[PDB]
């Protein structure tokens, strides 16, 4: 994120980091329950990537971080490579996350819901801090 | 050219497709919602993360970091998948597996 502040450790407990076997982080994700993560389609997760919940400082080794595995990657059939539409993908956890006080879950809106423009929402992640 | 160590956060507003379209024009689609141009910008490594909004005191998933300016410009809108539009799909899948 560019121009963001650093978070208060554990305050966005649903946020996971998706990483490759060699540890490299390529996309964020968010927990919707003990077994499912919602990430973006174009992230291109596979059953060989690992979901990592509980982390805040990716530099610190000493952290109660759960390092889960992917059972099934569900790419949304309607996602578009070219228009980037319907860019969503669910990940079925091979092994459920233990919800702690640093590993909580986010709430899905209702298809019926309407978030008015101007509403101050928040976004999080470990992406570049400057291009 | 390296990502942050500690997790980051930023507060930004939602835009009206209309207003977002003032920038992206027709590249904006139905299952897309915009937020930003407020001086903060999602950037490389953030995709598939969340844009959450406080609904009934509860943080709700409103979008997934998707795309935007190619240099993470903080003056243009960031475009996220619109969860309210995909939520149906989310449920059919959860409910089937």
């Amino acid at each position: 994120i560019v121009n963001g502040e650093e978070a208060v450790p554990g305050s966005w407990p649903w946020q996971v980091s998706l990483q490759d076997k060699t540890g490299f982080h390529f996309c964020g994700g968010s927990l919707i329950n003990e077994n499912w993560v919602v990430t973006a389609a174009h992230c291109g997760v596979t059953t060989s990537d690992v979901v990592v919940a509980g982390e805040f400082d990716q530099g610190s080794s000493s952290e109660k971080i759960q390092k889960l595995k992917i059972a099934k990657v569900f790419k949304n059939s309607k996602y578009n490579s070219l228009t980037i539409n319907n860019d969503i993908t669910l990940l079925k956890l091979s092994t459920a996350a233990s919800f702690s006080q640093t590993v909580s879950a986010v709430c899905l809106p209702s298809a019926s819901d309407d978030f008015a423009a101007g509403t101050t929402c928040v976004t999080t992640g470990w992406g570049l801090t400057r291009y | 050219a390296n990502t942050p160590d500690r997790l980051q956060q930023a507060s930004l507003p939602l835009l009206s497709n209309t207003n977002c379209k003032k920038y992206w024009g027709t590249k904006i689609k139905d299952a897309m919602i915009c937020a930003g141009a407020s001086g903060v910008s999602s950037c490389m490594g953030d995709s598939g993360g969340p844009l959450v909004c406080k609904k009934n005191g509860a943080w709700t998933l409103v979008g997934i970091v998707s795309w935007g300016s190619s240099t993470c410009s903080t003056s243009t809108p960031g475009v996220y998948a619109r969860v309210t539009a995909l939520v149906n799909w989310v449920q059919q899948t959860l409910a089937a597996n």
Binding site: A105 | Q9, A58
Partner: peptide, 11 residues
């Protein structure tokens, strides 16, 4: 869901 244990800040 949506209620974290440690409250987030400046949000």
């Amino acid at each position: 869901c949506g209620v974290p244990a440690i409250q987030p800040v400046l949000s």
